[PDB]
Design a protein around this ligand. Structure first.
Ligand SMILES: COc1ccc(S(=O)(=O)N(CC(C)C)C[C@@H](O)[C@H](C[C@]23C[C@H]4C[C@H](C[C@H](C4)C2)C3)NC(=O)O[C@H]2CO[C@H]3OCC[C@H]32)cc1
Ligand SMILES: [Cl-]
Ligand SMILES: [Cl-]
Ligand code: NA
Lengths: 99, 99
């Protein structure tokens, strides 16, 4: 699809068996999902943006479905009010910025 | 241009006669730049990032070139980890997300 930026670029994703809405975010290096359980081992990480840093759990090799396209990669889980699909998974679905 | 997301989508901007590097950020509603001097009056704005809320200076109707495309719009000045070009100016340069 071609997604305009007049509004936030929100799509439906499926992760951990759950359907969620998420933001396609080219400024996020990594994908960050609101608090949820995922299977497998994890390790702590700090990520920073406007306002400073938050602590998240890093899960590797997690599959997501993003607007109908399957991808696999690292997912960070932590206290965010909005699910963020970051570059590590945007690349896998062939997303590009065009102008 | 068509910009893939394997690396950060960094571009050169021109604002205040000066060249700076900025990140094209579809998850930002607003454009936020690090401390610099801009002409005219400013207004207060609170914006919320991943780490919490910060006060910024809002300057309206600022001329800015982004990857060679001309925009005239609102620029927020404050402590950001990187200069970010948000949707208010991405729309002016005709950017879309495609996959
Ligand atoms: C290492 O991997 C990551 C490291 C950092 C982030 S980040 O969420 O902090 N951020 C990085 C960027 C600031 C360099 C991504 C941004 O797109 C962030 C994305 C957010 C995702 C989620 C919803 C909302 C607030 C917050 C939580 C940040 C936008 N947007 C943002 O801060 O926008 C501000 C400027 O415009 C305004 O409009 C939106 C908030 C404000 C994500 C993954
Ligand atoms: Cl990854
Ligand atoms: Cl590619
Ligand atoms: Na894992």
């Amino acid at each position: 699809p071609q997604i305009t930026l007049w509004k936030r670029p929100l799509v439906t994703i499926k992760i951990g068996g759950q359907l969620k809405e998420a933001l396609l975010d080219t400024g996020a290096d990594d994908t960050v999902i609101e608090e949820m359980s995922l299977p497998g081992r994890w390790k702590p990480k700090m990520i920073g943006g406007i306002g400073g840093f938050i602590k998240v759990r890093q899960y590797d090799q997690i599959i997501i479905e993003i607007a109908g396209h399957k991808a696999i990669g690292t997912v960070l889980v932590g206290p965010t009010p909005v699910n963020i699909i970051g570059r590590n998974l945007l690349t896998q679905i062939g997303a590009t910025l065009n102008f």
